[PDB]
Design an enzyme around this catalytic site. Sequence first.
Site, short mmCIF file in Angstrom:
data_model
loop_
_atom_site.label_atom_id
_atom_site.label_comp_id
_atom_site.label_asym_id
_atom_site.label_seq_id
_atom_site.Cartn_x
_atom_site.Cartn_y
_atom_site.Cartn_z
N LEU B 109 -13.03 -3.11 3.18
CA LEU B 109 -14.50 -3.38 3.20
C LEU B 109 -15.23 -2.23 3.90
O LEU B 109 -16.29 -1.88 3.46
CB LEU B 109 -14.75 -4.69 3.95
CG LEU B 109 -16.18 -5.23 3.91
CD1 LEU B 109 -16.55 -5.61 2.49
CD2 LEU B 109 -16.30 -6.43 4.84
N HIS B 263 -1.65 -2.58 2.56
CA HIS B 263 -3.12 -2.46 2.63
C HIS B 263 -3.59 -1.95 4.00
O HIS B 263 -4.79 -1.57 4.10
CB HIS B 263 -3.71 -3.82 2.28
CG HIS B 263 -5.20 -3.87 2.15
ND1 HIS B 263 -5.89 -3.09 1.24
CD2 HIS B 263 -6.11 -4.69 2.73
CE1 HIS B 263 -7.18 -3.39 1.31
NE2 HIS B 263 -7.33 -4.41 2.19
#
Lengths: 284, 284, 284, 284
Positions: B109, B263
């Site tokens: 994000l 990730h």
Amino acid sequence: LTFESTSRFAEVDVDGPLKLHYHEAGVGNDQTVVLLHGGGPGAASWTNFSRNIAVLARHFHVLAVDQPGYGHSDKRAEHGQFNRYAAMALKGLFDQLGLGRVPLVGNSLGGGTAVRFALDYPARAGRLVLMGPGGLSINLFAPDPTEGVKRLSKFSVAPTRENLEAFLRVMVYDKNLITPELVDQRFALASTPESLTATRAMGKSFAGADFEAGMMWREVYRLRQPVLLIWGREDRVNPLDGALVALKTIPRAQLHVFGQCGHWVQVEKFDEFNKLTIEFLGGG
Amino acid sequence: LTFESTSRFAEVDVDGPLKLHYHEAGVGNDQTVVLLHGGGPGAASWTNFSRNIAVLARHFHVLAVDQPGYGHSDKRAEHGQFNRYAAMALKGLFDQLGLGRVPLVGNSLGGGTAVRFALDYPARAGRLVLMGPGGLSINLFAPDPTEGVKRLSKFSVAPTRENLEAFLRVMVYDKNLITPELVDQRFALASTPESLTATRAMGKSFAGADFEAGMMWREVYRLRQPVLLIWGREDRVNPLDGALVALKTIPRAQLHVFGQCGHWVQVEKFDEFNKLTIEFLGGG
Amino acid sequence: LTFESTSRFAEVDVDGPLKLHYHEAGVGNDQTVVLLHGGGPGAASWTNFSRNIAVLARHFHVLAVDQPGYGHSDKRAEHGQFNRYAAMALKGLFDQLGLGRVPLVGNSLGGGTAVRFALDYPARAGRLVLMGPGGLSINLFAPDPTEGVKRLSKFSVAPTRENLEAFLRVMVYDKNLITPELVDQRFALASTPESLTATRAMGKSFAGADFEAGMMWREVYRLRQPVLLIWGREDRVNPLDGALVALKTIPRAQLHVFGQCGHWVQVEKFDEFNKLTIEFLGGG
Amino acid sequence: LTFESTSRFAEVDVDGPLKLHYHEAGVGNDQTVVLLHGGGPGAASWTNFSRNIAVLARHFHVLAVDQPGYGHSDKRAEHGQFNRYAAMALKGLFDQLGLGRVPLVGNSLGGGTAVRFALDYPARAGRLVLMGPGGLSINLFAPDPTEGVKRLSKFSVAPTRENLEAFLRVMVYDKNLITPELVDQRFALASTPESLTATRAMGKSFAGADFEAGMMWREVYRLRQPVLLIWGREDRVNPLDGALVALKTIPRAQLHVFGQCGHWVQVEKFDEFNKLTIEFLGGG
């Protein structure tokens, strides 16, 4: 460090005596690294790695080897699958120099040799750094032969200065690297009857019996060492889509891609390439 | 360097007053860098970059900013497209701190926020380092939503410790990084009514009017700075196929992929990530 | 046409007697085609190909074979690499029924079997139609195991109705195809002690030392026949990135991708699938 | 059916009078389809679609439109972004002929026009069939310009018979389709002063400040109709990697790839192409 100060010869047995030329630097340093150059007409170790050998030799014991068919190594008219041929020669040299397990750095054809060596003699190859490599590359999107391979083939059939300049221009993003001096020097080496003989022998070597030995994308799942793949995003010889099977199947793989960079990463991005290679091989 | 020693607040105007929390370190150093964290429930700057801030602060003036909805920044129940919202807040902070053009580092994000910021305020963003980034990623092969996004959605609907542990496990290759201590700390922050409110607000923000603002793969061809994309080969939230439009269209792009890494590149490959980021931003 | 009216049995020899069940329709049609079903728990020929057999039998002599471990074929506790085991069973049936060269249609596990058969017995396989096939697929972008494979493994360890429903929901784009009736029917077949024995024997075989015979992406360059690869864009078991090595390396390959379609192409796009298969195999 | 028997003209208004030439066949068939040809020098409707018009006209009312700058349509010296210019011309024709919502078939440049038309006038476009299309293609792996585009540019600067032959040879997998007669016919049409004016006007428009309207990979998520993408695996102009953004983002997309086929799908796979187009557009 000069060509002459670093120059060495060895004789190894590969279906009979085989003279190998190589460059040695950083003799003080504990970690040995072997450098294997690209396979364009007139290529050799010193010119392929001119922006790298001095910097690497500050950290490592550098052995930059002229592959059979190139530079001052023997140029036989007949041999089998090229990467296996070159790998057998390198293995002969490792035994003569008393080397155990050593990391290898290879661009294009030299990357193909490094991989064939790491598959055939798995205990002798440490970490691999492979730039726009042949052999483990399979162009999943690009029709073969590529623009780059077709220009190499055109030179093999019509070995003119114009055909050599055309092949060199599709090897780099910044076409100003292909200076008149570079074209004249590569062409003088490429056009010799001995070099043209090797150049064609090498072509013929990739088709027929032992073509499977060239399809190393089928085999690199077995590599257990860390492998740093390095590509130019604009490589027109071995394009970026050729990296994907290797990146997926090699357990400890990494990939670095440089935008605004073709097939000669070690030249076009020399500083970034040098720093990646020094860090990846443990700083020496 | 501690959470408390580095803690700072600022108030900026984003459709009314907005409190922002951030961490400041390396105040001696000339080159400022802004760090933007990932958007998982309970994420914040100090915990997202715990393996990075001390090392980066040796070289750079580090500003690690809790994005609106996270950490100790305000958690409004209502806002527009999240990355544009967060980018407007950051731009308010740049103006208050008197910053000109500054490089940004963002995961997931935060990578989305960094890109939206670099597109909306192009003269304020220098070099970008983007790890498994949202927004400029478009998963050309992976069906959406991904396994990772579905586990985040399940937590939003059923915010239990079990659903949080499930989402954290698909964010890393080495599932032993998801310790009981980490799960307990993230869950305590994620489960607060204020955090859950922000968590859902952020969800709703990516669908409807201004969905185009989230499709930043359409726009990054306009970025003129060097951009280092960094991915974990095993990212199950924003998978590797999401890197390809950005790598192709950003003129001065680079890509680094780490095998055996999901990730959380900045955690799972902290040392390699730190060295890449220091070199790419000019060593400071 | 009914399950009962089309039901046939043969005994073949693969390390001893092996009972094969199959369905026969369109007898006297000039062209024979063999259908090989997918490998989900409780799968079998008739239920896998119910929207297809009646239509194909208008044009072809259809043999839909329950693979070993499925439907009413024998469910042994141990076997080698599954696709070679199934291909050896199919060769026994071809010899018993006096078949020469026959086109094969296979989804998922059955696509792997069709390929293993076409490689091992090249003169006995004609044109191949392969739908979301296993074996020749290699997911270049998707981390393995995929969301689909993980839900299959979860059922195998905890064979409950809820875990079967969860696995069936990632097989299709339109989750409304996963009706209570479908779940009930599949659960009934999948949870028999014999079926669980077969699914536990499948697990051991795929992670045994026989794994190389499963990596058919390494070998399909050898296929000489036309091959139609068919994929659902939203396949979450064998995702679309798994098509690329086979499309590149099979000389006479074709690929068809359906948007808004998961792993069960022959169900979710039954009409378009039937029409493609009929045209590709020569209209009958 | 002949060039002469099917030849029609219309005058439409796009910044003044614009003469459009088109071919009409299958009058009285219930379903109208519009064919838009590719953009190689000397291209036109009749020669582009000679292996297709007769077959399609059995099922459909066919309108094959020479785009502005090609065949017998007007060849202006200046225009904006080519696809929007051509789409505005096509809208003029639709209005003049009283067409409602019509499926479009377009190869290369014509596929770009079909898409620009479907985006700008969404109620006037039905199902799209797009063969190696420009505009919505973005070559994620292939360095631009491609080998195909470079040979087109070389002809544009040095419009010789030899440079046209070299460009036509990278359009097809089977180079024997490039007959002396084909070269002679295309060279005759391509080297008229009017045609060279049009090709020089094409160059300026593609590198003008109007370029964004050409980047239709950014916009095709808006298409609501079924879209059949058709590619030659060996396309060297718009290579297969250019399919991926459109396949991912068009909701009702399908992709068909032919092995052993270059950029001229409608010529090299004419029978399979005709059959796919007839079935996809509803059999007529």
